[PDB]
Design a binder for these strands. Structure first.
Lengths: 515, 121, 86, 615
RNA sequence: AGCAAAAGCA
RNA sequence: UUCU
């Protein structure tokens, strides 16, 4: 309660924390008590120059110029797994056989296709030794066929530590640690190679990779749990919206990724903590549910993960990824810039007319995955909810006009024509269902291609929007410094092809909204 | 009042697929739970499946799990049923139904108001 | 630095929970089907009486059989909301 | 075809479809490295905008420290922390005139908390940086470590347990020359004023990091007092943004554009600004708060006028420890070497990068035992609730009782964001009313940004991600926390899961549809974790068999718990009821007999204590 | 080799 | 270390 005197030491600090023309606390405190407003502020302004002012630069339908994209070499793919070129082997089995252990469900699934040639190279890497992959597909294959001769029922097979699996992971390709007292004698030092990244151009393949996601398929790909029974009216309004939603997204190619980017990450995370030093074989496994009510258990490829001595929040583990596909790498090589291409055989098959007998390829490549780019995959099911929060708010905007319940929007098959496309010579429209897939895919790609650049573009490609929407509605808008906004947008367009695309969508929205 | 019709009935070989259908009128279809009961020749009826007013809470008999799927559509006032890999003894007449409570678990599962015009072999 | 992942990992390992010596004599060592729930590391302090979660569900299908009706009278405020919903 | 979602904005407006833009990919960008190269940048920028001030050496610390307060006036539109002390008090004085007696009442509610608190209300806080070990530790152990030091000496007046008796000890410890952990006077002060830096991770909505700093131990008690005082002061006000939040802020945003929009003399424009202040923390100087704190505490008792006055004295001589350091390398021998932080004061400059030399050069003077020293600014993450009252006082000027001119305004202010609503009878009168605010708000040291701000006629604006069209106030305050399992036990997670969804429905704006679907993803993560799949599901795991034994063993299956066998039975009408009280009577006499057993040997028989080592 | 960016894991 |  009693603090009548502070001290003799910290008192000397307070007299050192005051304005310039003051050298005491007691002599300054009473000056505050003696303060009364004599109109000081109007005096200071009379001395401020006229070079300190905010001039309203009025916005108009000819001011916003298009954003200037990077120019340079075309970009490459940087996804953890393949998206559209994948190819999956299946058993087509109600009460599928293995069904509890991915290994036997994978080996059993491999016996469908037959006619496997010897492995063969197609396109080298251009940076690194290529035959050191060809000696892995043979290595894994012998260790895989070894199981049928063993029939011990193993849960997971720790692979061998051959040189071929020692290099593409880089077990001892690291440098040595030492303090400065022993290193100061060395005369070749350097901080690091921290510099500016390389500017990459915009390529076409990412547009032909997003359309194919907003397209129907045959299966369902998801099965959610249950809830209680609804009696109130506010619940039937939910069950009506959610049921119209789920019956327009389950038949979508983007939900294949949400349940493919979960089984891959969670097994890689559960195994890589229980078996650190030894390698492993992790098969990419995705469990489907088709049209007829008939289960399936597909297989996309194998994974080989190396040493994982993880202790902190952001460690790193690296793996190789073997993926099947037919996409002949001779038309879009810049997309498959980092990928090593093998050849395995020829799928003897006939189309509805004629015959193809097309080949079957493999795409081997190393990778790296921290302990947070895995936990950001297992929660992809949050993406569905983020695509419904948008559709719900768009409905409650009409609610301010009338009842505007969900019934008057989902059917009426062609009544509003939401414009979600730019065909040549026009903007072709589609129903709300084609919208309720396009918001999802844009949301899924925002998790696969997560990066700091996308976080910066959206923060500054939002104000240029609201300034435009105030013009089209004719509210007489204004900005202060435009060219400081563009330069803070173009600073985030470097190399990520996703962000480098949205600056071609935004740049084509102005041209059709009369800028 | 209670009106329930059937469809899709027809002879079929074993190990084959089939899809049934029903229809309703005269009451709030999205406020009551449905079931499917079947009477085999010379045997009393028993329950096959149930379903709620959300389309969420589904159950099945012990002997037909994984081979029967059930799904409703409140908008068109129907109640589909897809049975795949049909067993031999599954040939019998199938009867639609309508629970009284909205939920399914409470009370014992038995038909209360319906007539099974539809059949199958 | 996150507890959720440690709950999925540790449940991959058997016998995640801890209880002192009273659980030892109550239930058997393993179920009829063979799954074990009464491991023992033989510690000096408390003997490390560790049990699998199977003992929980086993306790609810088989075990003591009390007749108390004290618990409905404790959670009274939570019982008052039950009549308003109905 | 070529799909393109952002053509969606031609039919539907922007304020309704704005959720398409929020990419939610702001969490996984983390900081790679140690994080000192940024902390050597915030010290530089703090000294470029306040270079003109006379800098002097301080006593009993041996360090230069800047002081731009009351300095000259600027000429360029660039930022500037050149405040004016005779101007700040003039604003906060008029705040009392428009709001009578707001200060003298607010201090009274704080004058009793100082005597009716406890030291244990301090430890309930974030992570701290204890000054003994020189490492970040939690708030629980840092108090036992420092109090043992105070107990090691003859001073033991902390026995009363009151927080105010912890402050009398540190005040009675700072004067002793040498301390017995050993360490002298000039070496102990430098360790109590520190603010450890660390690169900020998980930045949601920014390209590059921010380099925030965490405080010590002795300081975090004083700032709790002043932060309490600015809370009450900013609670009785009308245009506040920080303390007023949630759904109630949805209402306040529409009242302002109702008052200021009333059209008397209906020949008058009405414009509205959406703003964002740049370098909000690099410019504010605690010497100004010391002018404010001693003005708030006018005619108050002396001892209470002292204690609040102490914290800005410490911030006015603060120091920021540098990060773990740099890591050099050589491609010849292929090694990496970890440099400490202190060696940067002696390392040769030629090894470093070219731009890293530009940082260390200007910071080469400011080095006190491997610790930089600055006092023109404030640190990120520290208290700013008091610095919101400052800019609010500018929103008081504009009631036509302080301009004496036709133009006038009134607005709404969070910390780094605001919004004005100006009114004048022509375009030109508006350009003067705003030119007076950008100017008058510079004398106080609060710059306005000219890139992240636009202007439009009223009826629509942005503020703190509460987007406002003509009457619609759709809010996006905080994102969704994944509705996942926590990891405590069975009965603990299931209670937390079906109450967080409740709170996010009445606090934020979460529709009735996306609350059901969220409850499907939570239970999907709850069953896979604890392996508690219900019986009729034909799954098989290391626990599945015994559950099916109990499934067939019971009559009415709606009574069972979800933790073992039972079904989900919730919806968006009964989330506010725990699981056991919901399906109590529904249970049969057998399950009920074995469920709530007072002889439960595990310990509510599902709640256990897992095995924890904390390695 | 690749992860991935203004500095670190290999 | 099985999310039909």
């Amino acid at each position: 309660e009693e603090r009548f005197e502070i001290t003799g030491t910290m008192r000397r600090l307070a007299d050192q924390s005051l304005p310039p023309n003051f050298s005491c606390l007691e002599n300054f405190r009473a000056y505050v008590d003696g303060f009364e407003p004599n109109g000081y502020i109007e005096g200071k302004l009379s001395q401020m120059s006229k070079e300190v002012n905010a001039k309203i630069e009025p916005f108009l339908k000819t001011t916003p110029r298009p954003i200037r994209l990077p120019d340079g070499p075309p970009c490459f793919q940087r996804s953890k797994f393949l998206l559209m070129d994948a190819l999956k082997l299946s058993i087509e089995d109600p009460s599928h056989e293995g069904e509890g252990i991915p290994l036997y469900d994978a080996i059993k699934c491999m016996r469908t296709f037959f006619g496997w040639k010897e492995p063969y190279i197609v396109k080298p890497h251009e940076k690194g030794i290529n035959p050191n992959y060809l000696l892995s597909w043979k290595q894994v294959l012998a260790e895989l066929q070894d199981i049928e001769n063993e029939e011990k029922i193993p849960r997971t097979k720790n692979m061998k530590k051959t040189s071929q699996l020692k290099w593409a992971l880089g077990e001892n390709m690291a440098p040595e640690k030492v303090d400065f007292d022993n290193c100061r004698d060395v005369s070749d030092l350097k901080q690091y190679d921290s510099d500016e990244p390389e500017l990459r151009s915009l390529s076409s393949w990412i547009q032909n990779e997003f359309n194919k996601a907003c397209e129907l398929t045959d299966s369902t790909w998801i099965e959610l749990d249950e809830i209680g029974e609804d009696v109130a009216p506010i619940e039937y309004i939910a069950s009506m919206r959610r049921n119209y939603f789920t019956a327009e997204v389950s038949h979508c190619r983007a939900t294949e990724y949400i349940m493919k980017g979960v089984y891959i990450n969670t097994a890689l995370l559960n195994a890589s903590c229980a078996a650190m030093d030894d390698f492993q074989l992790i098969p990419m496994i995705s469990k489907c549910r088709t049209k007829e009510g008939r289960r399936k258990t597909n297989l996309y490829g194998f994974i080989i993960k190396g040493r994982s001595h993880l202790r902190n929040d952001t460690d790193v583990v690296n793996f190789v990824s073997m993926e099947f596909s037919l996409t002949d790498p001779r038309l879009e090589p810049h997309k498959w810039e980092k990928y090593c291409v093998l050849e395995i055989g020829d799928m003897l098959l006939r189309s509805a007319i004629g015959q193809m007998s097309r080949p079957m390829f493999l795409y081997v490549r190393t990778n790296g995955t921290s302990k947070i780019k895995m936990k950001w995959g297992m929660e992809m099911r949050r993406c569905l909810l983020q695509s419904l929060q948008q559709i719900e708010s768009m409905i409650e905007a009409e609610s301010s006009v009338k009842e505007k319940d969900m019934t008057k929007e989902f059917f009426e098959n062609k009544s509003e024509t939401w414009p979600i496309g730019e065909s040549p010579k026009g903007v072709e429209d589609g129903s709300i269902g084609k919208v309720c897939r396009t918001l999802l895919a844009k949301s899924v790609f925002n998790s696969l291609y997560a990066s700091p650049q996308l976080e910066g573009f959206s923060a500054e490609s939002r104000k240029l929007l609201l300034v435009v929407q105030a013009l089209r509605d004719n509210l007489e808008p204004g900005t202060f410094d435009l060219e400081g906004l563009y330069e803070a947008i173009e600073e985030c367009l470097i190399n990520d092809p996703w962000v480098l695309l949205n600056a071609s969508w935004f740049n084509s929205f102005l041209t059709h909204a009369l800028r | 009042q209670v009106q329930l019709q059937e469809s899709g009935g027809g002879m079929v070989q074993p190990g084959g697929s089939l899809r049934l259908s029903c229809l309703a009128s005269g009451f709030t279809f999205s406020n009551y739970a449905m079931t499917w009961v079947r009477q085999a020749p010379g045997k009393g009826p028993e329950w096959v499946s149930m379903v709620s007013n959300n389309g969420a809470d589904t159950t099945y008999t012990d002997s037909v799990k994984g081979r029967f799927t059930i799904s409703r559509d409140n908008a068109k006032n129907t109640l589909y049923l897809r049975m795949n890999n049909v067993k031999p003894e599954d040939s019998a007449v199938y009867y639609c139904a309508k629970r009284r409570y909205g939920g399914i678990w409470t009370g014992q599962p038995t038909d209360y108001d319906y007539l099974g015009q539809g059949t199958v072999t | 630095k996150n507890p959720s992942l440690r709950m999925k990992w540790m449940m991959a390992m058997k016998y995640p929970i801890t209880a002192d010596k009273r659980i030892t004599e109550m239930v058997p060592e393993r179920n009829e089907q063979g799954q074990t729930l009464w491991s023992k590391m033989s510690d000096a302090g408390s003997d490390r009486v560790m049990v699998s979660p199977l003992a929980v569900t086993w306790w609810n299908r088989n075990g003591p059989m009390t007749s108390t009706v004290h618990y409905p009278k404790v959670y009274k405020t939570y019982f008052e909301k039950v009549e308003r919903l109905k | 075809m070529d799909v393109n979602p952002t053509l969606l904005f031609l039919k539907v407006p922007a304020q309704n479809a704005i959720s398409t833009t929020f990419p939610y990919t702001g969490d996984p960008p983390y900081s790679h490295g140690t994080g000192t190269g940024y902390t050597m940048d915030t010290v530089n920028r703090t000294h470029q905008y306040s270079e003109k001030g006379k800098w002097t050496t301080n006593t009993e610390t041996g360090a230069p420290q800047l002081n731009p307060i009351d300095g000259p006036l600027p000429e360029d539109n660039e930022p500037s922390g050149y405040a004016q002390t005779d101007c700040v008090l003039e604003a906060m004085a008029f705040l009392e005139e428009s709001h009578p007696g707001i200060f003298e009442n607010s201090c009274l509610e704080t004058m009793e908390v100082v005597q009716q608190t406890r030291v244990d209300r301090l430890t309930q806080g974030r992570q701290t940086y204890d000054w003994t070990l020189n490492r970040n530790q939690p708030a629980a152990t840092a108090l036992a470590n420092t109090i043992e030091v105070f107990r090691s000496n003859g001073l033991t007046a902390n026995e009363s347990g009151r927080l105010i008796d912890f402050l009398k000890d540190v005040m009675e410890s700072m004067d002793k020359e040498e301390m017995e952990i050993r360490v002298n006077k000039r070496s102990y002060l430098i360790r109590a004023l520190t603010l450890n830096t660390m690169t900020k991770d998980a930045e949601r909505g920014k390209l590059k990091r921010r380099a925030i700093a965490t405080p010590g131990m002795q300081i975090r008690g004083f700032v709790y007092f002043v932060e309490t005082l600015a809370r009450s002061i900013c609670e009785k006000l009308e245009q506040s943004g920080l303390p007023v939040g949630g759904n109630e802020k949805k209402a306040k945003l529409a009242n302002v554009v109702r008052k200021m929009m009333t059209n008397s003399q209906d020949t008058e424009l009405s414009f509205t600004i959406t703003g964002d202040n740049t370098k909000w923390n690099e410019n504010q100087n605690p010497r100004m708060f010391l002018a404010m704190i001693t003005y708030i505490t006018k005619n108050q008792p002396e001892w209470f006028r002292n204690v609040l006055s102490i914290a800005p004295i410490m911030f006015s001589n603060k120091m920021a420890r540098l990060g773990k350091g740099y890591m050099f390398e050589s491609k010849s021998m292929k090694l990496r070497t970890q440099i400490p932080a202190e060696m940067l004061a002696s390392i040769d400059l030629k090894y470093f990068n070219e731009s890293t030399r530009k940082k260390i050069e200007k910071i080469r003077p400011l080095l006190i035992d491997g610790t930089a020293s600055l006092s023109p600014g404030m640190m990120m993450g520290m208290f700013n609730m008091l610095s919101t009252v400052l800019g609010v006082s500018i929103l008081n000027l504009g009631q036509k009782r302080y301009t004496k001119t036709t133009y006038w305004w009134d607005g709404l202010q969070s910390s780094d964001d605001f919004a004005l609503i100006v009114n004048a009878p022509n375009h030109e009168g508006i350009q003067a009313g705003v030119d007076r605010f950008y100017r008058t708000c510079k004398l106080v040291g609060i710059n306005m940004s000219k890139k992240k701000s636009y202007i439009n006629r009223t009826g629509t604006f942005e503020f703190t991600s509460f987007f406002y069209r003509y009457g619609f106030v759709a809010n996006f305050s905080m994102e969704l926390p994944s509705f996942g399992v926590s990891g405590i036990n069975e009965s603990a997670d299931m209670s937390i899961g079906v109450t967080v969804i409740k709170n996010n429905m009445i606090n934020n704006d979460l529709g009735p549809a996306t609350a059901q679907m969220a409850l499907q993803l939570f239970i999907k993560d709850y069953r896979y974790t604890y392996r508690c799949h219900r019986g009729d599901t034909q799954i098989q795991t290391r626990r599945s068999f015994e559950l099916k034994k109990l499934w067939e063993q019971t009559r009415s299956k709606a009574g069972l718990l979800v933790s073992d066998g039972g079904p989900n039975l919730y919806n968006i009408r009964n989330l506010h009821i725990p699981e056991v009280c919901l399906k109590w009577e529904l249970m049969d006499e057998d399950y009920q007999g074995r469920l709530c057993n007072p002889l439960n040997p595990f310990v509510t028989t599902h709640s256990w204590i897992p095995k924890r080592n904390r390695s």
